[PDB]
Design a protein around this ligand. Structure first.
Ligand SMILES: Brc1cc2nn[nH]c2cc1Br
Length: 333
C-alpha cells in the first residue's frame, strides 16, 4: 500500500482561497523588457552554475543585480517570476525590479534591487551569540511571510542569504527552486543542496510542505552555533541520511518511516545501521561554547526532526525563548 498522505500544519489552504492566477504560474503572461536599459558592470561570484552581474539602470543611474536565466524550461522561468511578483515587498524578500530579454540572444534575465555581494556563508562562521539570534530572526520573518503566502523556498542555505552586516540587513534570494504549496500535491525530491536536504527528500517522501525550509534552517543554525560547516556532512544523498541518523538516531528514523508507510530504498538497508540519539553537548568545545546555550539547543532540537509535521513552524520558531532579547530590542527601537 502507498505512503500515508500529509498536510501542512499551517497555511494549508491559502492558495485554494486565492484567485487561480495567483498560483497558476503556467498561464502567467510576462511583459519582457529590454536588457539594454541595463549595462553590466561585473560578474558577481555565485558559483560555476550562476550568471549574476552587478549592472547600472541607465535611466536613473541606480545600481541593480541582473540574473541571466541559464537555459531551462519556460515553466520554471514563469514559476520564479510569479513567486518573486507574489512576495514583492515582503520582509527580507529580495525585490524583483524588472524582467528583460537581451535583444540579440533573446535570453531571459531578472533585475533585482541592489544588495552588497556578501552572502551569509562568508560571515555566519564569525558571528557573536546575539548576531546569530538576530539574523536567524530576520530569516524567520522571510520564511513566515513566504509560507503565509503559500510558497516554500526549498533552497534555504547560507549562500542564498545576502547580508549587509554594516546596516544589519538581510535578503533571502534565489527563488528558482521555490514552489506553491497545495494540499496533497506530490513534489520533486531533487531540490535543495545535499547538506540542507530534509529527511523527506532523502527517503523520497513527496507530499512535503513549508516544514522542509525549517529543516534547512536547523542545519544552518547547527553549523553556526557549533562552528561545524556543514553540520551533516554526507558524501552523497544516501550517506547524507546516515550522517543525520548518527546524530538524531535510528529509532526516531524508523518510527518516521513506519508512521508515513515510506518504502525505504534497499541501498539504505546496510548503511543506516543502529545509532543512539546524541546529546548536543557532544558537539560543544572551547571554540564554540560561547554560541551554545540551553535556549539555542532547545530551539535547534525542535527544528531538526525526521517527522516534518513535528518541526516548529516559522511563527512558532519566532516565539521561542532563544529570540526574547531580539524581540525585546526590536520593540525598543
Ligand atoms: Br546577488 C542575487 C542572486 C540571486 N540569485 N537568485 N536571485 C538572486 C538575487 C540576487 Br540580488
Amino acid at each position: 500500500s502507498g505512503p500515508v498522505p500529509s498536510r501542512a500544519r499551517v497555511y494549508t489552504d491559502v492558495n485554494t482561497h486565492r484567485p487561480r492566477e495567483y498560483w497558476d504560474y503556467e498561464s502567467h503572461v510576462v511583459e519582457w523588457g529590454n536588457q539594454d536599459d541595463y549595462q553590466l558592470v561585473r560578474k558577481l561570484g555565485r558559483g560555476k552554475y550562476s550568471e549574476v552581474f552587478e549592472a547600472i539602470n541607465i535611466t536613473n543611474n541606480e545600481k541593480v543585480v541582473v540574473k541571466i536565466l541559464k537555459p531551462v524550461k519556460k515553466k520554471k522561468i514563469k514559476r520564479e517570476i510569479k513567486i518573486l511578483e507574489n512576495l514583492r515587498g515582503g520582509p527580507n524578500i529580495i525585490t524583483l525590479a524588472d524582467i528583460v530579454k537581451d535583444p540579440v540572444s533573446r535570453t531571459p534575465a531578472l533585475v533585482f534591487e541592489h544588495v552588497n555581494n556578501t552572502d551569509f556563508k562568508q560571515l555566519y562562521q564569525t558571528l557573536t551569540d546575539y548576531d546569530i539570534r538576530f539574523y536567524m530572526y530576520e530569516i524567520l520573518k522571510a520564511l513566515d511571510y513566504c509560507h503565509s503566502m503559500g510558497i516554500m523556498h526549498r533552497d534555504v542555505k547560507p549562500h542564498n542569504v545576502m547580508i549587509d552586516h554594516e546596516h544589519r540587513k538581510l535578503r533571502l534570494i534565489d527563488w528558482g527552486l521555490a514552489e506553491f504549496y497545495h494540499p496533497g500535491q506530490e513534489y520533486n525530491v531533487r531540490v535543495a543542496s545535499r547538506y540542507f536536504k530534509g529527511p523527506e527528500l532523502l527517503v523520497d517522501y513527496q507530499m512535503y510542505d513549508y516544514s522542509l525550509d525549517m529543516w534547512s534552517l536547523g542545519c544552518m543554525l547547527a553549523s553556526m552555533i557549533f562552528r561545524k560547516e556543514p553540520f551533516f556532512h554526507g558524501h552523497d544523498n544516501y550517506d547524507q541520511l546516515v550522517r543525520i541518523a548518527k546524530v538524531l538516531g535510528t529509532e526516531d528514523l524508523y518510527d518516521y518511516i513506519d508512521k508515513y508507510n515510506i518504502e525505504l530504498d534497499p541501498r539504505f538497508n546496510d548503511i543506516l545501521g543502529r545509532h543512539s540519539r546524541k546529546r548536543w553537548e557532544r558537539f560543544v568545545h572551547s571554540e564554540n561554547q560561547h554560541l551554545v546555550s540551553p535556549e539555542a539547543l532547545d530551539f535547534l532540537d525542535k527544528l531538526l526532526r525526521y517527522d516534518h509535521q513535528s518541526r516548529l513552524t516559522a511563527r512558532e520558531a519566532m516565539e521561542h525563548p532563544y529570540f526574547y532579547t531580539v524581540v525585546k530590542d526590536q520593540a525598543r527601537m
